[PDB]
A = this chain, B = another copy of it.
Amino acid sequence: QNLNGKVAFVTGGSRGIGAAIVRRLAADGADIAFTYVSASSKNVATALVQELEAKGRRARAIQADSADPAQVRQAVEQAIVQLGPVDVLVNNAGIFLAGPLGEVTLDDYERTMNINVRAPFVAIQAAQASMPDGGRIINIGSCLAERAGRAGVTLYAASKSALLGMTRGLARDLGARGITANVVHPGPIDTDMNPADGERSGELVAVLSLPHYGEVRDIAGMVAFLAGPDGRYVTGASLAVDGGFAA
């Protein structure tokens, strides 16, 4: 189909938005290697791999802690050996550590920056050299990267807005080869980590233009759009899928 000849790599693909991305990209004919962080995620990752192979798509699951740069890098290396150079890189893994500014610890800072910033940069450093002409790099951001609407998200918004400059710099670095680099900014999304039924869901919905949480298919649809033929001229852009949070 659209992605028939392409190889995709998705960090954190065993669940949530990452699972929706691997399903959409596989349904478009890409082979996908994806990572899972916890050993508890291993069985579901193997189940998802068996799921894709029962539809004729090739799939690989590689454990890799997002906090460990060596594991992220060697996971990308293993994917390359098994599937060939990746055409579509999706930096999906991230963590949301929030709270009062005076209680933030160096452990909070280090984990947030290692996962939300360093891991996408390491995967890009490992993938970019062999990336074929016309490749796609797709970072996953947040609506909080552009607007911190409330107190308590300073550390997280800083880590996500770091992706804005990295993505714009990557578009200049790789554009001569036809490789695009874009960042997608989810608004509130109904996941295990952020249920739409939560007590704070109403406070979030009130500041949206569309009065409801989004779904993982919205993020996966934007990622598939950037991965495919219609995204070939989109690069260096920040693309909100936020329900009008910024409007």
Contacts and interface: CB of A to CB of B under 8 A. Distances in A.
Copies per assembly = 4
Interface in A119-149: 121-122, 125, 128-129, 144-149
A236 to B, nearest CB: 3
Nearest to A225: B225
A164 interface: yes
Given A102-B129, A125-B104, A235-B243, A154 B176 contact: no
A176 B150 CA distance: 11
Nearest to A98: B169
Contacts of A247: 147-149, 168-169, 171-172, 175, 235-236
Q: What DSSP secondary structure best describes chain A's contact surface?
A: helix
Interface footprint category on A: 35 or more
A210 interface: yes
Interface string A153-164: 111111111111
Contacts of A102: 125, 128-129
A179 to B, nearest CB: 9
A199 interface: no
Contact of A151 (B122, B150, B173, B232): B173
8 contacts: A101-B128, A147-B168, A149-B172, A149-B247, A152-B173, A209-B236, A218-B230, A221-B231
